[PDB]
From a paper:
[name] is one of the hSULTs that is most divergent in sequence, and examination of the binding pocket revealed two significant differences that are predicted to affect PAP binding. Second, the magenta PAP binding loop is much shorter in [name] than in the other hSULTs, and lacks the conserved Lys residue that separates the key PAPS binding residues Arg258 and Gly260 (SULT1A1 numbering), which results in these residues being out of register. Interestingly, some residual electron density was observed in the PAP binding pocket of recombinant [name]. However, PAP when added at concentrations as high as 90 mM did not stabilize [name]. Significantly, this protein, which is expressed primarily in the brain, binds to 2-hydroxylestradiol, thyroid hormone, T4 (3,3′,5,5′-tetraiodo-L-thyronine), and the catecholamines norepinephrine, epinephrine, and isoprenaline (but not dopamine), suggesting that [name] may modulate the bioactivity of these compounds via a mechanism distinct from sulfonation. [name] is inactive as an enzyme in our experiments, likely due to its inability to bind PAPS or other sulfonate donors. This orphan SULT likely has an important function in the brain, nevertheless, because it is highly conserved and binds well to the neurotransmitters epinephrine and norepinephrine.
Cytosolic sulfotransferases (SULTs) comprise a family of enzymes that catalyze the transfer of a sulfonate group from 3′-phosphoadenosine 5′-phosphosulfate (PAPS) to an acceptor group of the substrate. As expected, all SULTs share the same basic fold: a central four-stranded parallel β-sheet surrounded by α-helices and three loops that are often disordered (dashed lines) in the absence of PAP and/or substrate. The crystal structures of SULT1C3 bound to PAP, apo SULT1C2, a ternary complex of SULT1C2 bound to PAP, and the environmental toxin, pentachlorophenol (PCP), and [name] were solved at 3.2, 2.0, 1.8, and 2.2 Å, respectively.
Residue numbers in the entry: 13 to 71, 84 to 146, 156 to 284
Write the structure that this text describes.
Amino acid sequence: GEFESKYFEFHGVRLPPFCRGKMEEIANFPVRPSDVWIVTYPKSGTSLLQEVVYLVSQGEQLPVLEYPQPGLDIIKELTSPRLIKSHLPYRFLPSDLHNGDSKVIYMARNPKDLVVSYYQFHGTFQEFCRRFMNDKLGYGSWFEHVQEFWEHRMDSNVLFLKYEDMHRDLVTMVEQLARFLGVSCDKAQLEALTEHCHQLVDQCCNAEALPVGRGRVGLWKDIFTVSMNEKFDLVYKQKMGKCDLTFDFYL
């Protein structure tokens, strides 16, 4: 696990090696009330939802807190309002966020598309999927990462979003974000801002009215074999447990 430093094992969670020696500094990271924290499972292919949030907050570019670059020292001195990305589980986030400070948006995605995206990000797909099912990837069990943010979705500084809802209902979503983030609009400004989010999304879309590539919903169906999928579903039901979280696996 930590053999040859491949991973850094922290309180039962396998983290990338670059997380070693800074979990105390992140726990203590001073959060500003005007910060916007975007959390995603790694390589989950939600960039487009990220662009929409960025666009909303104003009615390679975004730093990751725990990454080698730009580093925590640069992130401390960034001018407000800061847009800060992380892949850490809720529990490993700055302790200020656990007390209700600032605003954390978690972007979930159904786990079948997410494994394809992760695998296609730039190894058989099948070993990768197996490593995913056996909780072997950096940042830990996906089932744990998602269920912890779902459990906190009613918290006042937490908005749990699902990637697929951005395609089924962008309108609800954009306003949900506007209100969460205290971006105050009259009617017309909300209609306009929504139409900008729409145009920005639609510009990646094809005849499915869905993005082409890793951000496509139902992508997994073209990749998973029948047995792979039967093995997945079985793991998924077993690891999800009593959790009442559901996804759209296609649109």
